[PDB]
Amino acid sequence: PELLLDSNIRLWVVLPIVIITFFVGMIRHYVSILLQSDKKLTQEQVSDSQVLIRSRVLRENGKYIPKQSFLTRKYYFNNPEDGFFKKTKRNVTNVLPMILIGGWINMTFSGFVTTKVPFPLTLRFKPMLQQGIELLTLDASWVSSASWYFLNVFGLRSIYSLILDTNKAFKTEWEALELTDHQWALDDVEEELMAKDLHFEGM
Amino acid sequence: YEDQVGKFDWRQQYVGKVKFASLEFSPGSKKLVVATEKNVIAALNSRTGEILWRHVDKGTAEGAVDAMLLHGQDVITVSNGGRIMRSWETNIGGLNWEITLDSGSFQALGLVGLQESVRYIAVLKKTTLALHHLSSGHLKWVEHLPESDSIHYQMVYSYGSGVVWALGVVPFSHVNIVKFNVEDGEIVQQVRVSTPWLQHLSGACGVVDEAVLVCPDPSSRSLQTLALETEWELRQIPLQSLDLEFGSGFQPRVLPTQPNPVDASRAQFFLHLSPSHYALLQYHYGTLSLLKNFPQTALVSFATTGEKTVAAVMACRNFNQTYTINLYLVETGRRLLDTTITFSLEQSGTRPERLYIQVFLKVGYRALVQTEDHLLLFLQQLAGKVVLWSREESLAEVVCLEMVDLPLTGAQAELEGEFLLGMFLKRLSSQLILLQAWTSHLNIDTLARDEFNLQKMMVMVTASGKLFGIESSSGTILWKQYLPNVKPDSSFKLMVQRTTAHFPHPPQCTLLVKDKESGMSSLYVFNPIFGKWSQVAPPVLKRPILQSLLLPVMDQDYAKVLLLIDDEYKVTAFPATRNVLRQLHELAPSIFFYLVDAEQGRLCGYRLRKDLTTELSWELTIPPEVQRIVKVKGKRSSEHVHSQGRVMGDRSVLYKSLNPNLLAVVTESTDAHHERTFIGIFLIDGVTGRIIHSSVQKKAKGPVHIVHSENWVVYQYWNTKARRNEFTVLELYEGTEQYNATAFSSLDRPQLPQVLQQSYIFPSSISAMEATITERGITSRHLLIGLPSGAILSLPKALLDPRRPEIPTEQSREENLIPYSPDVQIHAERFINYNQTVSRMRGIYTAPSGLESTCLVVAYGLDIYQTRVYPSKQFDVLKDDYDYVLISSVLFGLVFATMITKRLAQVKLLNRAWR
Ligand SMILES: *[C@@H]1O[C@H](CO)[C@@H](O)[C@H](O)[C@H]1NC(C)=O
Ligand SMILES: *[C@@H]1O[C@H](CO)[C@@H](O)[C@H](O)[C@H]1NC(C)=O
Numbered sequence A: 001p002e003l004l005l006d007s008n009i010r011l012w013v014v015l016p017i018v019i020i021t022f023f024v025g026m027i028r029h030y031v032s033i034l035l036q037s038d039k040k041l042t043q044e045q046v047s048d049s050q051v052l053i054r055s056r057v058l059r060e061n062g063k064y065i066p067k068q069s070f071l072t073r074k075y076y077f078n079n080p081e082d083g084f085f086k087k088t089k090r091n092v093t094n095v096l097p098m099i100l101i102g103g104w105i106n107m108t109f110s111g112f113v114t115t116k117v118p119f120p121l122t123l124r125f126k127p128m129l130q131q132g133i134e135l136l137t138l139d140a141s142w143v144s145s146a147s148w149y150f151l152n153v154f155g156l157r158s159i160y161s162l163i164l165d166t167n168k169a170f171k172t173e174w175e176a177l178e179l180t181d182h183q184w185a186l187d188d189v190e191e192e193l194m195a196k197d198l199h200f201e202g203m
Numbered sequence B: 001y002e003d004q005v006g007k008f009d010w011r012q013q014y015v016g017k018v019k020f021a022s023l024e025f026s027p028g029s030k031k032l033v034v035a036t037e038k039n040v041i042a043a044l045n046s047r048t049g050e051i052l053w054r055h056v057d058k059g060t061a062e063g064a065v066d067a068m069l070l071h072g073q074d075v076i077t078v079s080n081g082g083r084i085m086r087s088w089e090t091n092i093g094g095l096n097w098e099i100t101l102d103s104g105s106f107q108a109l110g111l112v113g114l115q116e117s118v119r120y121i122a123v124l125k126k127t128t129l130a131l132h133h134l135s136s137g138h139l140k141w142v143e144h145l146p147e148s149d150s151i152h153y154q155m156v157y158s159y160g161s162g163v164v165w166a167l168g169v170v171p172f173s174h175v176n177i178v179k180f181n182v183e184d185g186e187i188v189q190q191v192r193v194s195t196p197w198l199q200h201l202s203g204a205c206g207v208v209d210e211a212v213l214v215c216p217d218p219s220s221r222s223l224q225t226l227a228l229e230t231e232w233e234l235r236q237i238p239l240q241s242l243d244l245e246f247g248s249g250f251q252p253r254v255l256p257t258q259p260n261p262v263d264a265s266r267a268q269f270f271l272h273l274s275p276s277h278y279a280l281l282q283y284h285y286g287t288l289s290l291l292k293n294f295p296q297t298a299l300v301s302f303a304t305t306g307e308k309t310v311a312a313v314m315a316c317r318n319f320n321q322t323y324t325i326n327l328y329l330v331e332t333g334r335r336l337l338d339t340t341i342t343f344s345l346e347q348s349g350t351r352p353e354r355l356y357i358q359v360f361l362k363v364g365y366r367a368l369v370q371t372e373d374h375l376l377l378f379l380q381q382l383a384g385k386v387v388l389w390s391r392e393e394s395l396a397e398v399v400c401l402e403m404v405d406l407p408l409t410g411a412q413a414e415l416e417g418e419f420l421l422g423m424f425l426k427r428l429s430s431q432l433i434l435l436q437a438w439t440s441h442l443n444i445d446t447l448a449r450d451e452f453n454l455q456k457m458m459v460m461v462t463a464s465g466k467l468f469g470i471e472s473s474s475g476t477i478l479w480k481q482y483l484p485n486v487k488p489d490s491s492f493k494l495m496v497q498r499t500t501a502h503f504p505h506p507p508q509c510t511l512l513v514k515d516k517e518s519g520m521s522s523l524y525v526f527n528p529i530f531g532k533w534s535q536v537a538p539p540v541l542k543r544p545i546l547q548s549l550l551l552p553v554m555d556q557d558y559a560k561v562l563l564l565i566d567d568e569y570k571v572t573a574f575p576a577t578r579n580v581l582r583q584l585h586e587l588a589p590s591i592f593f594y595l596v597d598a599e600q601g602r603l604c605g606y607r608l609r610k611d612l613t614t615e616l617s618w619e620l621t622i623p624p625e626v627q628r629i630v631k632v633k634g635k636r637s638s639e640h641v642h643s644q645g646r647v648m649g650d651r652s653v654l655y656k657s658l659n660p661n662l663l664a665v666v667t668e669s670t671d672a673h674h675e676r677t678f679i680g681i682f683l684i685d686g687v688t689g690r691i692i693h694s695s696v697q698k699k700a701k702g703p704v705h706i707v708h709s710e711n712w713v714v715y716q717y718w719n720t721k722a723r724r725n726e727f728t729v730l731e732l733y734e735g736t737e738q739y740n741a742t743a744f745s746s747l748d749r750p751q752l753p754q755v756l757q758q759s760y761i762f763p764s765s766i767s768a769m770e771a772t773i774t775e776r777g778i779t780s781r782h783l784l785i786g787l788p789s790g791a792i793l794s795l796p797k798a799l800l801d802p803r804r805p806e807i808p809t810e811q812s813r814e815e816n817l818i819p820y821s822p823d824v825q826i827h828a829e830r831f832i833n834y835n836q837t838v839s840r841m842r843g844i845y846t847a848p849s850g851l852e853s854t855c856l857v858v859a860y861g862l863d864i865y866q867t868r869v870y871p872s873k874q875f876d877v878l879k880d881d882y883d884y885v886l887i888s889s890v891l892f893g894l895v896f897a898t899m900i901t902k903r904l905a906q907v908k909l910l911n912r913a914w915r
């Protein structure tokens, strides 16, 4: 902390770029909201997805119901040529407005020093952290503005959160549903229930 | 750079101390003329101290003026012991003709006219007499003094018409008179008369009426008079008829007037009888008649308007350095009712000692005073503002100076005051005070420093015994002091001993003066801010002092200690309190003195003891018949260096040897002849006395110029074998490892480092040379060069590097070492002083700011200069170009865009819901 720097630097070059990046990271969110579209694609695809999800949940938790019923639907889905799967046949935006602005800055706020980082850095990285200076004697903790900008960028990622084919798919479902066990899995609940007591104390 | 061009630099220029002058140009247009000790000629403007043209020629005594004369539009100057004669124009500084004379002594000069014009001028040089024309210069004729070996011909006169007289005296035997006449060259009758009572007529007597000589004989208390045209066996009038006694131990003298060399002088004249006794008298053929006598007069001048002839008289009034001046009409004695000026000086012991007059014909008059110290004043016939202007010409010879920091604001004072529960409540109180101050909110006695201080009050001391204080930005003398009884040649040392960082404690500085004839010495202590002696009285030195050091160890009042060494090898410690004495009884044996005498060429080195005495420790000589020490240098104690090593090309390190206690010694030969001349260098340690390096550079003689910085050395000299100036540079490197990297005791290093060096050439000559400085040593270091033309040059040290590729390898290529620059260049793009040239430039001073990117420069010679330098482009100040309007036109753009695209997405989304 051996140097004495103009306070006008603090005022007019530091706070501007702890602000700008914050408001730009907000605007990016709001504009992304305003940008995204949404198709009205088709009745066919939506229906097909819905039934595929019915199949998924069948394979997942089809083990709380009578066995014959599970097997009945499994047959309605797998039965040769009746089974449903055997009859139906058919970054950049992030990075770039952040890399274009660092350039503007380093073209604008160039010929001076900004601040100090309290952990010692490596020397080879000097010529790109200062970028205006012609001392080639300072330690590299004394940086230019661009580094402050990028540091702010990476540091304010986590503080916006706090303030805010068809046929093959069908056949794969069919194949993954062929191998399936009912496993009814309800066949001791009676005893388990009447094992210790009934539990209710909120009346 | 317009800003620095007009915000922080400046240049005062002076001429020195007036010997001669000449007023009363045609009416007197705006101007007057002087001819000073420093060989200058100036043409000042008589409404305000300001120069039209200087024509400074030569510092050293081969241009020193010996006489001066104004022929109403032009001037005449006789320099170099009678040899050279010049005429100027008095309008633009434009010379019109110069010539040279034979060898002589210039007994005197006069301006002769034959009957109605002034065509010729006359010169007397103790052997002959010369007579030249005015406009041409080309000699008219010379005659020879009849005997010219014992007479000491001391005076010329010409009462207008016809002819010329030449007058000489042997001390206590006789005088001879001679007459020549124009356009012959021939010696008219010469007269001799015996007069064994005078011993000179240089400053004794002068012609009064149309041939008439009158000289005083204090023996017989009378006046021996002579018509010089129609009488010999000179007459005598006893000065007892008039109660007009002489003084006891005086050489009384005579003051005539001759406003026209074509008409005779006037029959009224002045006598200086005693120091403060002046008499006006009048001469008829035999009847002397007193008109007035002045008993309390120090100074008087004659003057003459178109017809009238007047006498200005000076007097003290009663005291408090208050003088009065009055006019008198010479023909009568009658004082003129009006025209009493009354003025006063500000200093304590200071006397006018000189008075010149200018006269109007409204009737007006303006006076010029060269008071003692060197000061100059121009007084006008007014009441309210009587001093039209004042000119402080003592600064034309500066000796040593310093730059001191200003005092504090209130904020910082109470802040210091701010610094268990007592701690907390103290803090709170001070905070609440500053708070109330903020709420409430929203020249010698009111000045204080600013952030990144650049104001840096200056203290300069002067060969005439006059101390100053200046602001260092638009330099305005704020205070002055005068310490008396100071010879022309003495020796000063100026030490700073407590600065402005401890609010209740007042600063102080200290000054050591020698006398140079008796060896006596004096210690004056003061406060550099207001200019006042301090209350504490310094001790009285009995013996001749030799040297002194400053010893930054403090006392309980934050003051350094200033050890002084006697001639009988006994120490004196100025703040001699008990605390300091115990500190010394502890740490004395780590304090060493080194002394040097060039007469016999020997060096010595002493150390302290528990008590204050000195035991000789090392001793060393140099033969004074082949070596003659020129100067000795040592590192500035007030420097701090950042890096202990220099990174090599392949990420290796080369460590450097600092040796605080080192010193450089430079010598030159006795057998001066340009085949066998040589310059010697020695590098010594102050503690032990061992020579690190001992070098010789042959065929080189010249006046040298040296700099000895942190681990490098530079010296400039002159090569007689290719008749060119040269630079030579040294660097010291220990090696690749560190030897007790934390301590550096000089009693522990056996192994001596490796010297690198190199020699370049330089296309010009040199005057004072110095190096930049700033605390923390970070930024690049430059060399400030004073050329003879007055321009300053900033040279980068990194250009003078002994490790320069010299047909590079690839390591040097990587190390970007700029191989061996031939003929180190001079282009006028790095001159500080664009049109602010300094004339003689005996010296330079460089001081550090608080901003670490600026250095404060002061060039002192016959004329001052002051500025700031930026070795590395001011990296810690914002840009001096900032656009504060764009940035306040951007944030609002973004804030309103954010509000916009907040209220503009909530809505589109809501509308997506209720489609
Ligand atoms: C000394 O001279 C100054 C000049 O203004 C004057 O003010 C002061 O009164 C004088 N001293 C005395 C004792 O009158
Ligand atoms: C270094 O010097 C200090 C002081 O002279 C001494 O105490 C220490 O032992 C030395 N160490 C080495 C490694 O030279």
Ligand SMILES: *[C@@H]1O[C@H](CO)[C@@H](O)[C@H](O)[C@H]1NC(C)=O
Residues within 6 Å of the ligand: B834, B835
């Ligand atoms: C010095 O020279 C510059 C240009 O070389 C000029 O603009 C400036 O007015 C000059 N200064 C003076 C005092 O003449």
